[PDB]
Design a protein around this nucleic acid. Structure first.
Length: 1302
RNA sequence: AAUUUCUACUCUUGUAGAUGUGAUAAGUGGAAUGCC
DNA sequence: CAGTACGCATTCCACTTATCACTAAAAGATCGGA
DNA sequence: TCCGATCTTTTAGTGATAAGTGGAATGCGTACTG
C-alpha cells in the first residue's frame, strides 16, 4: 500500500560541483604581487617529486615486516574447497570468518601484536607503526629508527621545504592507512595475500599435484627447467607447490621471481629465450602424443600471482634503454644514417642481389622458420607456396605422402625447388621485391634528417625511412645464415656481414617507437593554497579564521571570500552584521557539529584528562571547560565506550554474539541518556532543541538514533554585511574576492540553466534553509589552470559564416562538404566545389558574423577554479535498509506496471521497446539519432581514426567525448520515458570477460558505462522543469535504484533496474517462440549427417501454395540437440516458397529471403549473397531425380540417394533456413525472418512492418528482455518471500515463452 | 561555433542534455616490436 | 581442404574497479616576552 | 625558567550488508594441424 512518489528520502548521496572564479578589482593584482600562484606551482611540483620518497619508506617498512612471516595456510584452504564443494551459507560464514582471521593474523605483524614473535621487536614494530601515520616522516624520526634507506641532502632539503605543512599530506596518510588496513579493503596488503593470491597458489598446488600423479615424468623436466633458470635453488619443485612454502612469496621480489619462473626470461632481441614453466606444457601439447592427450584432458594453466600492493616490479629480462629527448634520438639517427651513407651499403646490397642471378639458386637456401611471410610477400597467400612445395615433392616420390609434410618444417629448402614447385614468376617477383626494397632504402638515404618532431609529417617521414630500414633488415633474414647445407660460403659470409651491420636498426626502431608514441607536452591545473595549510576545509564560524573560506550572496551572484594569512599572522578580520535594509553582501554563517557518533566521545569520554583520571580511581569526573554546566562521566559509561575488546556493550554486535537483550537494552538506555546529557551541557549544542527525539527506552538500534540525531546539529543562517567593508577589505588586500561563476550566471541567460546550477540554487533556497534536505560540505579546493597556448582563429567582422545544420533542422551536413561550403562562404576556396556541393548549395542557410566567437576561449587565458562537494537527500540515513524489498513490495502492490527494455550492441547501439503487463507493446523506435545528426556515422570514423593514428605514431585521442555526448541525451530519453510510464527498466546481465573482450575488438565500451551512468542518475534524480517542493524536485529527488558500492555487492536487481540472464535473448520468434535446438559442431561426418537427416519426421510439398512442410520431434537428434528443447512437442518447419509480397507501406520483398555472407575460403572471407533456399532445393531435387510434385513423403527419396552431396546440401539448406539473423552491412537491409507458421496462419517476417510486432532483430531482443522482466514479475507474484530467485534458467525461460506464446 | 567540463548546435553576447571532485593503489585491453 | 584452437616478453597509449575525505575540536609545537 | 596565544597536526567512530546456474549474450584473425 504505497505510491510511486514514495521512493524518495531513503538514503543520502553526495555530489561535487565545479565553478570558475573571477577576481573582482585589485584582488588579482594583490594575488600577483604576493606571488601565491608561483609558490603553489613550486609546492605542487615538490609534492609530486617527493611522493616517491615516502613511498620508499613505506615499501621498506613493508617488506622488512613481511620477511618474518610465520603462519599456517591449511585452514583457509580447507574453508575454500569446502565452499567450492558445498556453496552453503554456513560454509560461506566459516570461509569469511577464517579470511578475517588470516587478514588480522598478518596484520598483527604490522601492528606488533602476534604472540609467536619476540616482545622486543614487536614493541619496535608497534612504535614504528605509530610512527608511520603521524608527522614524523619529515623530521626523520622513523626514518633513522628504521635506519636502512639513505637520503641525500637534496632529499633532505626537499623534505625540509614542507615545514609546518604536513597536513597537505593528509590524503596521502589515509591512502596509505587503507594500504596497511585489514578490513577486506581491495588495496590492503592482508586482503591481497589472503584473497587475491592465496587461492591462486592453492589451486596451483592442486593442479601441479594432479598433473604430477597423472604424468610422473614431468617433475624431471620441471626440475631441469628450474635448474636452468636457477631460481629457488634451495627448494625442490613439489616443495615450491605446497602450502608451507606460502610462508614465502609474500614480498615483492619472491612473487616476481615466481612469476618469472612461470613466464621465462628473455635476453635482448635476436637471441634465444629460456622456456617458462607453462611453455614446456605448451610444447608437450605440441608433441601431440598420448601424453599430450592425457595432459589436455586435465587443465594445464598455472596462473601467475598478482603483484603486491605498494611495491615496484623487478624483472630479470632485458629492459631496453629509453630516450628522454628528441635531440638525442635524432642525432643518434644522424650518425646512424651517416654510417649508412659512408659505408656504401647500396653497392654491396645490389651486388648481393645480383648473385641470385650470377650463381645458381641451388646454392642459395632460405630460412624455413619464416618462409610464411616470404609466401605472403611473393605469392598472394601465405599457404600457397607451402602447399605447392608439398604437392611438388609428392609428385617426385598415405604415410609416404605425409612424409613430405613431416619433413618440410624442419629443414632449409633451396630457392630453385620453390621456383620449380610454384613457377618461374617468383624469380621476377623476387628481383622486383629487392628492387623496391633498395628503392625505399635509397629514398631513405635521399631523405634528409628533420629539425624537430612537433609536426606530424616529421614523424611520418622518420617512420617511413624506419620501415625502409627494417624491411631491408628482414629481407636479409629471408636467407639462411648457417652453412650446414650447400650454400655458397661467400654468399653466406656476405649476408652475415651485411646483416650484423644492420642489426642495431631493429633496436633503433624499437626505441623510436618507445619515444614517439608518448603523450605530447601539455599543462594542466594544480591546487592553490595561498600558504594556508587547511584552506577551505570547513566553513564553520569557529573554524573560518584559519580555514579562510566564506561565501557571499549579492543579488543572485555568489562570491567566494578568501582572507589570507597577512604578514604570517591570522588577522581577525570580522564584519558586524548590518540590517537587511542596508545594501551590501550576505555573508553565510555555517554552524556544524560533524558527527554525533564520532565526536560525542571525542569531546566527553576519550579526552586525555578523563582517561588519566579513570585508570587510577573510580570516582566520577566533572568537566568544566567548553561546558556551560559541568558534565559528569561515571565508570558505568566509560567501561561501555572503552570495553578493552572489539564489541562494545551498547553495540548490536554484543547482542548478536551474546544475546543478553535485557543487558544490551539497559546499556543502550544509559548511553542514550548520557548522549542527551552531553548535548544538553556542551557549549556548541546547548542552544539546539532536542525535543523532536524519542524517549530513551523506545529505541531499538543505536545507529538509528545517530542517523536521527545527525541532521539536527547542522544549520545555516544568513546575515547582511555592508559593502563598504568588503570593498575596503578587497582594496587593502585583507580579503580576496572571487565570484562563483558559470555561464548560467552570465548576462544573456534566457533558458533553463545547467543542473549543477539548479542544485547550487536549491542549496541556498529559503525552503532548504528552514529544513535542510541537501547540505553543503567542506574540503573545497581551488585550482589554477594556466594559459594553455594555442593559436587563435575566429570569425572576424564583415565575414559571412556557415551554420552546421540545413534549413530543415533534421538533416545535418557532412564534414567533408562542411569544410568546402565554409571555404566558399568565407570566399577562401582552395579547391573547386563538387557536384553534391552544387546540389546542396541553395538549400543551406548562412549568417553574418557578430559577437566575435573564439574557439577554445576557456583554454585561451588562465582561469581560477573551485570544486565544492555537497550532500543530497540529507535527512535520510547514510545507507538504505532493504531497498529491493521495498521495490518488490511496491511491484507486488502494483501488478499493472509497464516494462521497458534496453539493448546494447554494435550495429544498433540502443533500442527502445515498451510493453504492458499482458505483453502488448506500447511504443518502439530508434535512437541511433536523437533527431540531430546520427552519432554512429561520426563515432565509427573516430574509432577507425584512432586505430589508424595509433600505428601511424600520431596523437591517439579519446573516445569518451563522443561516447558520453551520445549517452547523455540517450540517458535523458530513457529517464523521460521511465518517469512518464512509471515503468521498470531491464538490461541484460553479461559475464565480465565478455564485455571486456568486446571492448577489446570494438571501441564501444557501452556494455558497462551505460550501466554506470544509468545507475548514477537513477539513484539521485532531479528534473529541471519539475517544481522544487514536489517529488522529483531538488529537495525530494527520485531514488529508484539501490546505492551501488561495488559490483561484488551489486546484484540481480537494483531497485527498478532488472538484470536478466544473457543466453537466448535475441534470436527468438515473438509469434511462437522458435529457436534451433541443434548445434552445427556435432554434425561433422557423413553418417552423423544421415542421422540429422533422419531426425526429422516427414517432408511434404503442399502444391496449393508452394510451401514445403518439414516436421521434427525432439525425441530424435538428441546428440545434435544441446539438451535444451522447446516446450511444444511438435515443430513443423514451413519451408516456404520464395514468393514476393509487399510490406505495410508497399515495398516489394521476397518471403523466406535469407541473406548469408558468401565466404570465399573457410577463413570467414568474402562478401554477402542474396540467396533463396526454396529454388535451391527444387534444383537439388531436379538434379537428383527426386520427385516433389507428388506431395507424399520425400525424405525417403532423399535418403535413398546415399551420395554425400545430397545429404550435405540439404543439411546446408537446413542450416541456411534454421538461422535467425539476416543482415546486410553493404546495403543496410538487416531483418529477421521466422521459418515456423503461427497458429494464426502466417510466418513472421520483419518486413510485415505492423506496429504490434518488432521491426528488427535488436527490437526482438529488447522485446524478449521485456518479457523476461515480465516473467520475473510473475515469479514475484506467486512468491510470498518478498525476494527474488537467483536469476532464471534458460530452459525455464524457454518453457515460459512457449506456454505464453502458444 | 561561445561551455565548471563534455557533447550536438546557433531564434538567442548564447541554446538542449549530462556532469562526484581530489588523491592513491591494483587490474584490464589495444598498437608496434622481437621471441617460441 | 579446411578444423580447431593460440605462450611469452618490452615500450607506449587508453580504460576500469576499488578505497579513502565529505571536520570541528582536542592536542601539541612554539614564540615573544616576561 | 615559565606562560598564554597562536598556528599546525591528530582524532574520534554506528549498522547495515550473498548468493547463486547455464551457455549464449554479438561481430567474426591467423596458423599449425584435424
Amino acid at each position: 500500500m504505497t505510491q510511486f512518489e514514495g521512493f524518495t528520502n531513503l538514503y543520502q548521496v553526495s555530489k561535487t560541483l565545479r565553478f570558475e572564479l573571477i577576481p573582482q578589482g585589485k584582488t588579482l593584482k594583490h594575488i600577483q604581487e604576493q606571488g601565491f600562484i608561483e609558490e603553489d606551482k613550486a609546492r605542487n611540483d615538490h609534492y609530486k617529486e617527493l611522493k616517491p620518497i615516502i613511498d620508499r619508506i613505506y615499501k621498506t617498512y613493508a617488506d622488512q615486516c613481511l620477511q618474518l612471516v610465520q603462519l599456517d595456510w591449511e585452514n583457509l584452504s580447507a574453508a575454500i574447497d569446502s565452499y567450492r564443494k558445498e556453496k552453503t551459507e554456513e560454509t560461506r560464514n566459516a570461509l569469511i570468518e577464517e579470511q578475517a582471521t588470516y587478514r588480522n593474523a598478518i596484520h598483527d605483524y604490522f601492528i606488533g601484536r602476534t604472540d609467536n614473535l619476540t616482545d622486543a621487536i614487536n614493541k619496535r614494530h608497534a612504535e614504528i607503526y605509530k610512527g608511520l601515520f603521524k608527522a614524523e616522516l619529515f623530521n626523520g624520526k622513523v626514518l633513522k629508527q628504521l635506519g636502512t634507506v639513505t637520503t641525500t641532502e637534496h632529499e633532505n632539503a626537499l623534505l625540509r621545504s614542507f615545514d609546518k605543512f604536513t597536513t597537505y599530506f593528509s590524503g596521502f596518510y589515509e591512502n596509505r592507512k587503507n594500504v596497511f588496513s585489514a578490513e577486506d579493503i581491495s588495496t590492503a596488503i592482508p586482503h591481497r595475500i589472503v584473497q587475491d593470491n592465496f587461492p591462486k597458489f592453492k589451486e596451483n598446488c592442486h593442479i601441479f599435484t594432479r598433473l604430477i600423479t597423472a604424468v610422473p615424468s614431468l617433475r624431471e623436466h620441471f626440475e631441469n627447467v628450474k635448474k636452468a633458470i636457477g631460481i629457488f635453488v634451495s627448494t625442490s619443485i613439489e616443495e615450491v607447490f605446497s602450502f608451507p612454502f606460502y610462508n614465502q612469496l609474500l614480498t615483492q621480489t619472491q612473487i616476481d621471481l615466481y612469476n618469472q619462473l612461470l613466464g621465462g626470461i628473455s635476453r635482448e632481441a635476436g637471441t634465444e629465450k629460456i622456456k617458462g614453466l607453462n611453455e614446456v606444457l605448451n610444447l608437450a601439447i605440441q608433441k601431440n602424443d598420448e601424453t599430450a592427450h592425457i595432459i589436455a584432458s586435465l587443465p594445464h594453466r598455472f596462473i601467475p600471482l598478482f603483484k603486491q600492493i605498494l611495491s615496484d616490479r623487478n624483472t630479470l629480462s632485458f629492459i631496453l634503454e629509453e630516450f628522454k629527448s628528441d635531440e638525442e634520438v635524432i642525432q643518434s639517427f644522424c650518425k646512424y644514417k651517416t654510417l649508412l651513407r659512408n659505408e656504401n651499403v647500396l653497392e654491396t646490397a645490389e651486388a648481393l642481389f645480383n648473385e641470385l642471378n650470377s650463381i645458381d639458386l641451388t646454392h642459395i637456401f632460405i630460412s624455413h622458420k619464416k618462409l610464411e611471410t616470404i609466401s605472403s610477400a611473393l605469392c598472394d597467400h601465405w599457404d600457397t607456396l607451402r602447399n605447392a612445395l608439398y604437392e611438388r615433392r609428392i609428385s617426385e616420390l598415405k604415410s609416404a605422402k605425409e612424409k613430405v609434410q613431416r619433413s618440410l618444417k624442419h629443414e632449409d629448402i633451396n630457392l630453385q625447388e620453390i621456383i620449380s614447385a610454384a613457377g618461374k614468376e617468383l624469380s621476377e617477383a623476387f628481383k622486383q621485391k629487392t628492387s623496391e626494397i633498395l628503392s625505399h632504402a635509397h629514398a631513405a638515404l635521399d631523405q634528409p634528417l628533420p629539425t624537430t618532431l612537433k609536426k606530424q609529417e616529421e614523424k611520418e617521414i622518420l617512420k617511413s625511412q624506419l620501415d625502409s630500414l627494417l624491411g631491408l633488415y628482414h629481407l636479409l633474414d629471408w636467407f639462411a645464415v648457417d652453412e650446414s647445407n650447400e650454400v655458397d660460403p661467400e654468399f653466406s659470409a656476405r649476408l652475415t656481414g651485411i646483416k650484423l651491420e644492420m642489426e642495431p636498426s631493429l633496436s633503433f626502431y624499437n626505441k623510436a617507437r618507445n619515444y614517439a608514441t608518448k603523450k605530447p607536452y601539455s599543462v594542466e591545473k594544480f591546487k592553490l593554497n595561498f600558504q594556508m595549510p587547511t584552506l577551505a576545509s570547513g566553513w564553520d564560524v569557529n573554524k573560518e579564521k584559519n580555514n579562510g573560506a566564506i561565501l557571499f550572496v549579492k543579488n543572485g551572484l555568489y562570491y567566494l571570500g578568501i582572507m589570507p594569512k597577512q604578514k604570517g599572522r591570522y588577522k581577525a578580520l570580522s564584519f558586524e552584521p548590518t540590517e537587511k535594509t542596508s545594501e551590501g553582501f550576505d555573508k553565510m554563517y555555517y554552524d556544524y557539529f560533524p558527527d554525533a557518533a564520532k565526536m560525542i566521545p571525542k569531546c566527553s569520554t576519550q579526552l586525555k584528562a578523563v582517561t588519566a583520571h579513570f585508570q587510577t580511581h573510580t570516582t566520577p569526573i566533572l568537566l568544566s571547560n567548553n561546558f556551560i554546566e559541568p558534565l559528569e562521566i561515571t565508570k558505568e559509561i566509560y567501561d561501555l565506550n572503552n570495553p578493552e575488546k572489539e564489541p562494545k556493550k551498547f553495540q548490536t554486535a554484543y547482542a548478536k554474539k551474546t544475546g543478553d537483550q535485557k543487558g544490551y537494552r539497559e546499556a543502550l538506555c544509559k548511553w542514550i541518556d548520557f548522549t542527551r546529557d552531553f548535548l544538553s551541557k556542551y557549549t556548541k549544542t546547548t542552544s539546539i532543541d532536542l525535543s523532536s527525539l524519542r524517549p530513551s527506552s523506545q529505541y531499538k538500534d543505536l545507529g538509528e538514533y545517530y542517523a536521527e540525531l545527525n541532521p539536527l546539529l547542522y544549520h545555516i543562517s544568513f546575515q547582511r554585511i555592508a559593502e563598504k567593508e568588503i570593498m575596503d577589505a578587497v582594496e587593502t588586500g585583507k580579503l580576496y574576492l572571487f565570484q562563483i561563476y558559470n555561464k548560467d550566471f552570465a548576462k544573456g541567460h534566457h533558458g533553463k540553466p545547467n543542473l549543477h546550477t539548479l542544485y547550487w540554487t536549491g542549496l541556498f533556497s529559503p525552503e532548504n534553509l528552514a529544513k535542510t534536505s541537501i547540505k553543503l560540505n567542506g574540503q573545497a579546493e581551488l585550482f589554477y589552470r594556466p594559459k594553455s597556448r594555442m593559436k587563435r582563429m575566429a570569425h572576424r567582422l564583415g565575414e559571412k559564416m556557415l551554420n552546421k545544420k540545413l534549413k530543415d533542422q533534421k538533416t545535418p551536413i557532412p564534414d567533408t562538404l562542411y569544410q568546402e561550403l565554409y571555404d566558399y562562404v568565407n570566399h577562401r576556396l582552395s579547391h573547386d566545389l563538387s557536384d553534391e556541393a552544387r546540389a546542396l548549395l541553395p538549400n543551406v542557410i548562412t549568417k553574418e558574423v557578430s559577437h566575435e566567437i573564439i574557439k577554445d576561449r576557456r583554454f585561451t587565458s588562465d582561469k581560477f577554479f573551485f570544486h565544492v562537494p555537497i550532500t543530497l537527500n540529507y535527512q535520510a540515513a547514510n545507507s538504505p535498509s532493504k531497498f529491493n524489498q521495498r521495490v518488490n513490495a511496491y511491484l507486488k502492490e502494483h501488478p499493472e506496471t509497464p516494462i521497458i527494455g534496453i539493448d546494447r550492441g554494435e550495429r544498433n547501439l540502443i533500442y527502445i521497446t515498451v510493453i504492458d503487463s499482458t505483453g502488448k507493446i506500447l511504443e518502439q523506435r530508434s535512437l541511433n539519432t536523437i533527431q540531430q545528426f546520427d552519432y554512429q556515422k561520426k563515432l565509427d570514423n573516430r574509432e577507425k581514426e584512432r586505430v589508424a593514428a595509433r600505428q601511424a605514431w600520431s596523437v591517439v585521442g579519446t573516445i569518451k567525448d563522443l561516447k558520453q555526448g551520445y549517452l547523455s541525451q540517450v540517458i535523458h530519453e530513457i529517464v523521460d520515458l521511465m518517469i512518464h510510464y512509471q515503468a521498470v527498466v531491464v538490461l541484460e546481465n553479461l559475464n565480465f570477460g565478455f564485455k571486456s573482450k568486446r571492448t577489446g575488438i570494438a571501441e564501444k565500451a557501452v556494455y558497462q558505462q551505460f550501466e554506470k551512468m544509468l545507475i548514477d542518475k537513477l539513484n539521485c534524480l532531479v528534473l529541471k522543469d519539475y517544481p522544487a517542493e514536489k517529488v522529483g524536485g531538488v529537495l525530494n529527488p527520485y531514488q529508484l535504484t539501490d546505492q551501488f558500492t561495488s559490483f561484488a555487492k551489486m546484484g540481480t536487481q537494483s531497485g527498478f533496474l532488472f538484470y536478466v540472464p544473457a543466453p537466448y535473448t535475441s534470436k527468438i520468434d515473438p509469434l511462437t517462440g522458435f529457436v534451433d535446438p541443434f548445434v552445427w559442431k556435432t554434425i561433422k561426418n557423413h553418417e552423423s549427417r544421415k542421422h540429422f537427416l533422419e531426425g526429422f519426421d516427414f517432408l511434404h510439398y503442399d502444391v496449393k501454395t508452394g510451401d514445403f512442410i518439414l516436421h521434427f520431434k525432439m525425441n530424435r537428434n538428441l546428440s545434435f540437440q544441446r539438451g535444451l528443447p522447446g516446450f511444444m512437442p511438435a515443430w513443423d518447419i514451413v519451408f516456404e516458397k520464395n514468393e514476393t509480397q509487399f510490406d505495410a507501406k508497399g515495398t516489394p520483398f521476397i518471403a523466406g529471403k535469407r541473406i548469408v555472407p558468401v565466404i570465399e575460403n573457410h577463413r570467414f572471407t568474402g562478401r554477402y549473397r542474396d540467396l533463396y533456399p526454396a529454388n535451391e532445393l527444387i534444383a537439388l531435387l531436379e538434379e537428383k531425380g527426386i520427385v516433389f510434385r507428388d506431395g507424399s513423403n520425400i525424405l525417403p527419396k532423399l535418403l535413398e540417394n546415399d551420395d554425400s552431396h545430397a545429404i550435405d546440401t540439404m543439411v546446408a539448406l537446413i542450416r541456411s533456413v534454421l538461422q535467425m539473423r539476416n543482415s546486410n552491412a553493404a546495403t543496410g537491409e538487416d531483418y529477421i525472418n521466422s521459418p515456423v507458421r503461427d497458429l494464426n496462419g502466417v510466418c513472421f517476417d520483419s518486413r510485415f512492418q505492423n506496429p504490434e510486432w518488432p521491426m528488427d532483430a535488436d527490437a526482438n531482443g529488447a522485446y524478449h528482455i521485456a518479457l523476461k522482466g515480465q516473467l520475473l514479475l510473475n515469479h514475484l507474484k506467486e512468491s510470498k518471500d518478498l525476494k527474488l530467485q537467483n536469476g532464471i534458467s534458460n530452459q525455464d525461460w524457454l518453457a515460459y515463452i512457449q506456454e505464453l506464446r502458444n
